[PDB]
Ligand binder design. Structure first.
Ligand SMILES: COc1ncc(-c2ccc3ncnc(-c4cccc(C(=O)N5CCN(C(C)=O)CC5)c4)c3c2)cc1C#N
Lengths: 249, 977
């Protein structure tokens, strides 16, 4: 019960978080979720589960004998060694208030600060998503501005090709009004293209600014995410200390 | 790209009544023309050429009949408008201009590609631009399924086309539960057959009593006292196949509720001639020295070169690095390998990473999962690692070639709530958005192309084995049990259901063990479809395993259960490594041979086309479906354009008119809905909640804007069916724009599955899983319950107010039926909400019918949503039965917990809770198949562990009943024995 690797009544998911991204040999023993005991050993990126009875007739009198023997001995007899224990007293620190009222008051501080940061992270994620969507909308509209300008430029080419051959016939005819009506329609077409080009230009600047706005929202979320994880785990430690230092059923 | 909004112009949700249009004539001239927003292109082209005579070079212009309009769509497409009967406001123009051109190319092929691209929400021409050889191969190879289905659709007479359009909606088994048979009169049922005579359409009533399992032709024969067909009065449901009458879902439901089954007799030619003839045609794109993997003699190594940029400020983060790992599904094949830590502003590595896995030992489904993480020493000795962007790569391609050479990979944003450093559940491939962090890579070269070996080149006693096969998919399996399953791998054939347990015992990092497991699944006997679905989730990615699971569904999965679990079967499509696989071929085959299946097959895919992670895969699949679905593409486009005008209308209400009163928004609603363009779209189309329901004329007097901030629309339609009075005369649907309805859709699906499990076991616990369908990004429809009211409405402060309200409505001899219905509905929802962890209930969540039937609404949150926000870990009782409900169950008696009625109510809860616990593998598999859908409360298997707690799977069945009994006592403070 006083062993560092024994955690008692803990779920299998709590062991996954504790053995998350650990090296080969990290182990801890817990009460089997039902057997009686189950050893979880990190090896090859997987949290191996090993029942404790543990194979064939029993060769060890106690569980403390089974752990300490195998740490030095290695587990090859069954089929790495138990190199690294997960001490239960390692997290006994960071909960230093040491009395029932100091903890709980500190838990109220941590839980409050956690709800502040949680609402800050949520609203930042809504700006993050809204900016990602509006950036995608502006890129599509720039794609449509590209195709629209191509079409109106094709109208200039088509007008130029068909004209000139007609305007030189109107010059020998002496009809200045027919020349003025062709040039007036060409000025109307070119001015419209200048308006569409300037519209795409302003849309590219709004996208250029909104891309940098997305870039800073992404940095802010990458900075508050680590602080939000540790603040929740600190709150859960002070809460766990409060349940342990309280009446148990 | 997809259209940014549903408005009529870019930046303009709604065109003004008149609008100037720049008309680009084919002579170079440009004519500004004022047009009405609802004017057709025929009218606009005639008005244009009448004005073009007043502009220069008009002698060059030909007849207007020789021209069509072309313009830039909001989807950036250069669309040609061959359908000149379309209104200007329906063209989805990016800007108000039209270019006059002469039609060229294949006209009919361009018209079909336009209609397909409209249903999918994406121009089909963008698939032609894809350079990926796998994408183009999928478009050509999948046409085999399209041809095989259309040939099977007209292999037979119009009856085959009728079985496609109107399939039989029947149960999976002809047998009847003994609590269903006891409602029959000596095994016979009283039904009413109606006939509509030829002149004046006079309806005649024919009550007749026949055997419950009478084939539909037998029913017709009794009515005569013979080639006709039967139809449900009020909807498009037909009794075409020779199933027993009781097996049809409509008749089976009538026997339950004691309602009278009203059918209608019509001639076979009345429906056979009404059916159009679907003709599928081949598209345009269909016409236009290697070493082995086991020969390579080296270990695996991958080189991380550089990353273009990373969005992190150097003030808060110390350094950055690239974390990698080889995965077979969700488990690594070797320990993860990291790169050396580099500064944030300079993300370059040029580092080879050595994985301790021999290359011939790599399995077929091997995948490289990597990410760019940030490390911060920060406080104390421990440091914080946070992922910034992730990416997954299939180490082999669809050709089976091993990856080699340099490779640039654009990474994805980390999903919200995901705190792991890697994301092996995410999709494979590069990010289409090239404005993202790009990671340069390089795989080693073996002087040739490396290919995967061919199938020819690859070669306690009974108990405890049984005990393991009955455990739930997420149960703990020790290494001693893995060595026990692998050593007994040949005896497991007698218990074929243990195959998922055996596959997880295989050392997939061992070429020797995988070679032997392939030969076992080659001759493995079939398993039930409910169990083969597990082999299609993310934990089983092997092609031979997934192929075996698909073959089980091809032979043993009825269309009833296929429609029931279609949501999950669509979700596991994104777990696939490649576009072409047996699963996508099986689903597309069934969707093209059953319009009830293809209807929801279409909408489940269309609803996720906004998601850039699956938009390419779902777009290519929707293309092949719409290419061969026949005349139903016309009906689907009517549903789509109706949903587009609802989206556009609700967008206006919560953006430009958000700061206006209810009366102003209602006046804008009734004025806009009465326009001709709006009336043509939202009248006369099939309901997306149930394609058997025809939505007729809108009843604008009944349409309302609900008082929620999302402004949900309460819409009402007439039933154009000749006999609407026998089913429902009005069809009421709630259109919601703003809230994600995927969790509601899944929960209501689970509720229906739980209710079916109860009915088959003789438990008549009546649930109400109303329709709910997500149609897009936070857009969906919700079925309205006809005569229901929330508990708050009933109260509007005595506890007996609810019981006295049920005394009315059901006054007289129908009182015991209302109390019985209220008790049985409470029992089902008390157990269902406890197992699923639904959000807490209140006077606004709980509704009651005039029937006495109780049910819940707004299943927004499931499982352990509160554990992350509040450290306490408890299994909540969301539906605590107040004294108001207890008085109703006890018929007004005080001391309700000790009455005879409450004790019988407890038996219903215990029977239902244990019944669902016996089918725990089904629900755990259904939740597991959704881990990649992106729903926030279903990201990992730890989120599924909540129903393992509520169902108490790690205990005995007797202990689990004590656990459920204590949970009820803790929430109700006592009274549960
Ligand atoms: C997840 O989102 C949802 N989930 C389910 C439903 C849903 C489903 C079926 C329903 N079936 C029947 N009624 C409702 C229903 C619910 C609440 C209010 C009303 C209503 O308009 N009232 C106005 C008149 N009045 C007065 C003056 O007292 C009575 C209340 C109707 C239903 C609501 C809706 C949404 C959403 N948004």
């Amino acid at each position: 019960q006083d062993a560092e690797w024994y955690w008692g009544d803990i779920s299998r998911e709590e062991v996954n978080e504790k053995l998350r991204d650990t090296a080969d040999g990290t182990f801890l023993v817990r009460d089997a979720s039902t057997g009686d005991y189950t050893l979880t050993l990190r090896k090859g990126g997987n949290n191996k589960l090993i029942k404790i009875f543990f194979s064939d007739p029993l060769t060890f009198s106690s569980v403390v004998e089974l752990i300490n023997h195998y740490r030095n001995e290695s587990l090859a007899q069954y089929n790495v060694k138990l190199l690294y224990p997960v001490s239960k007293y390692q997290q006994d620190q960071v909960v230093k208030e040491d009395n029932i009222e100091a903890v709980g008051k500190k838990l109220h501080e941590y839980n409050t600060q956690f709800q502040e940061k949680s609402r800050e992270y949520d609203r930042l994620y809504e700006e993050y998503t809204r900016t990602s969507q509006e950036i995608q909308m502006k890129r599509t509209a720039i794609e449509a501005f590209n195709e629209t300008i191509k079409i109106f430029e094709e109208q200039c080419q088509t007008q130029e090709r068909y004209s000139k051959e007609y305007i030189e016939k109107f010059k020998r005819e002496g009809n200045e009004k027919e020349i003025q009506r062709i040039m007036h329609n060409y000025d109307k077409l070119k001015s419209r293209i200048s308006e569409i080009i300037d519209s795409r230009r302003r849309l590219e600047e709004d996208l250029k600014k909104q891309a940098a706005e997305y870039r800073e929202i992404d940095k802010r979320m990458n900075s508050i995410k680590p602080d939000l994880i540790q603040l929740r785990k600190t709150r859960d430690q002070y809460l766990m200390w409060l349940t342990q230092k309280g009446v148990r059923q | 790209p997809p259209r940014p909004s549903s408005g009529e112009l870019w930046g303009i949700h709604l065109m003004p009544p008149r609008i100037l249009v720049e008309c680009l004539l084919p002579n170079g001239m440009i004519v500004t023309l004022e047009c009405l927003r609802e004017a057709t292109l025929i009218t606009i082209k005639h008005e244009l050429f009448k004005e073009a005579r007043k502009y220069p070079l008009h002698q060059l212009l030909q007849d207007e009949s020789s021209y069509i309009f072309v313009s830039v769509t909001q989807e950036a497409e250069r669309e040609e408008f061959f359908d000149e009967t379309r209104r200007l406001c329906d063209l989805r123009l990016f800007q108000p201009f039209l270019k006059v051109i002469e039609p060229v190319g294949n006209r009919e092929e361009k018209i079909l590609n336009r209609e397909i691209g409209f249903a999918i929400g994406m121009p089909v021409c963008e698939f032609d631009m894809v350079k990926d050889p796998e994408v183009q191969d999928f478009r050509r190879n999948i046409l085999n399924v399209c041809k095989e289905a259309v040939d099977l659709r007209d292999l037979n007479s119009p009856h085959s086309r009728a079985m496609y359009v109107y399939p039989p909606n029947v149960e999976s088994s002809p047998e009847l539960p003994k609590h269903i048979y006891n409602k029959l009169d000596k095994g016979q049922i009283i039904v009413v057959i109606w006939v509509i005579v030829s002149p004046n359409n006079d309806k005649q009533k024919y009550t007749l009593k026949i055997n419950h399992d009478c084939v539909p032709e037998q029913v017709i024969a009794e009515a005569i006292r013979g080639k006709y067909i039967l139809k449900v009065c009020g909807c498009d449901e037909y009794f075409l196949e020779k199933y027993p009458l009781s097996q049809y879902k409509y008749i089976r439901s009538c026997i339950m509720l004691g309602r009278m089954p009203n059918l209608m007799l019509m001639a076979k030619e009345s429906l056979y001639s009404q059916l159009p003839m679907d003709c599928f045609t081949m598209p345009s794109y269909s016409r236009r020295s290697t070493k082995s993997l086991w020969v390579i003699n080296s270990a695996l190594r991958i080189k991380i070169l550089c990353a273009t940029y990373v969005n992190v400020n150097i003030r808060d983060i110390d350094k950055i690095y690239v974390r990698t790992g080889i995965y077979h599904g969700g488990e690594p094949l070797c320990d993860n390998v990291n790169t050396q830590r580099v500064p944030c502003s300079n993300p370059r590595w040029n580092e080879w990473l050595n994985y301790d896995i021999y290359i011939p030992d790599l399995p077929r489904a091997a995948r490289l999962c990597l990410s760019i993480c940030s490390v911060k020493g920060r406080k104390g000795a421990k440091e914080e690692h946070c992922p910034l962007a992730w990416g997954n790569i299939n180490l082999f391609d669809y050709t089976d070639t091993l990856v080699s050479g340099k490779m640039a990979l654009n990474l994805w944003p980390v999903p919200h709530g995901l705190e792991d450093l890697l994301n092996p559940i995410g999709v494979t491939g590069s990010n289409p958005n090239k404005e993202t962090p790009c990671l340069e890579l390089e795989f080693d070269w073996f002087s040739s192309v490396v290919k995967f070996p061919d199938m020819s080149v690859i070669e306690n006693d009974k108990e405890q084995l049984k005990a393991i096969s009955t455990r739930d998919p997420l149960s703990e399996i020790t290494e001693q049990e893995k060595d026990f399953l692998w050593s007994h791998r040949h005896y497991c054939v007698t218990i074929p259901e243990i195959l998922p347990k055996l596959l997880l015992s295989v050392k997939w990092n061992s070429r020797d063990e995988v070679a032997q497991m392939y030969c076992l699944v080659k001759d493995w006997p079939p398993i039930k479809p409910e169990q083969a679905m597990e082999l299609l989730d993310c934990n089983y990615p092997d092609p031979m395993v997934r192929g075996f699971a698909v073959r089980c569904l091809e032979k043993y999965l009825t269309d009833d259960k296929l429609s029931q679990y279609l949501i999950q079967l669509v979700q596991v499509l994104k777990y696939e490594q490649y576009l072409d696989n047996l699963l996508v071929r099986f689903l597309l085959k069934k969707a093209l041979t059953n319009q009830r299946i293809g209807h929801f097959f279409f909408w489940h895919l269309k609803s996720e086309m906004h998601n850039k992670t699956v938009s390419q895969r779902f777009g290519l699949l929707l293309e092949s479906y719409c290419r061969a679905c026949g005349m139903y593409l016309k009906h689907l486009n009517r549903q789509v354009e109706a949903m587009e005008k609802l989206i556009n209308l609700t967008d206006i209400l919560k953006q430009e008119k958000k700061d206006e009163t209810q009366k102003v928004q209602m006046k804008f609603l009734v004025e806009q809905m009465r326009r001709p363009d709006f009336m043509d779209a939202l009248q006369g189309f099939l309901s997306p909640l149930n394609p058997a329901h025809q939505l007729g004329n809108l009843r604008l007097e009944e349409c309302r804007i609900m008082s929620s901030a999302k402004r949900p629309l309460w819409l009402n339609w007439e039933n154009p069916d000749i006999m609407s009075e026998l089913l429902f005369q009005n069809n009421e649907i709630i259109f919601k724009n703003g809230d994600d309805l995927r969790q509601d859709m899944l929960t209501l699906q689970i509720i229906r599955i739980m209710e079916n499990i109860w009915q088959n076991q003789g438990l008549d616990l009546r649930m109400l899983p109303y329709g709910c369908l997500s149609i897009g990004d936070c857009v969906g429809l919700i079925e309205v319950v006809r005569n229901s009211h929330t508990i708050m409405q009933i109260q509007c402060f005595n506890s007996h107010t609810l019981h006295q309200w049920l005394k009315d409505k059901n006054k007289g001899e129908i009182y015991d039926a209302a109390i019985d219905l209220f008790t049985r509905s409470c029992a089902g929802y008390c157990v269902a909400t406890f197992i699923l962890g639904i959000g807490d209930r209140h006077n606004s969540n709980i509704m009651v019918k005039d029937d006495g039937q109780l049910f819940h609404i707004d299943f927004g949150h499931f499982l352990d949503h509160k554990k992350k926000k509040f450290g306490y870990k408890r299994e909540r009782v969301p539906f605590v039965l107040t004294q108001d409900f207890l008085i109703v169950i006890s018929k007004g008696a005080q001391e309700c917990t000790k009455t005879r009625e409450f004790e019988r109510f407890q038996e219903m809860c215990y029977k239902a809770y244990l019944a669902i616990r016996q089918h725990a593998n089904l629900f755990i598999n259904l939740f597991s198949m959704m881990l990649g859908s992106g729903m926030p409360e279903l990201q990992s298997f730890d989120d599924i562990a909540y129903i393992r707690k509520t169902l108490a799977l790690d205990k005995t069945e007797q202990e689990a009943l004590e656990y459920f009994m204590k949970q009820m006592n803790d929430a109700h403070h006592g009274g549960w024995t």
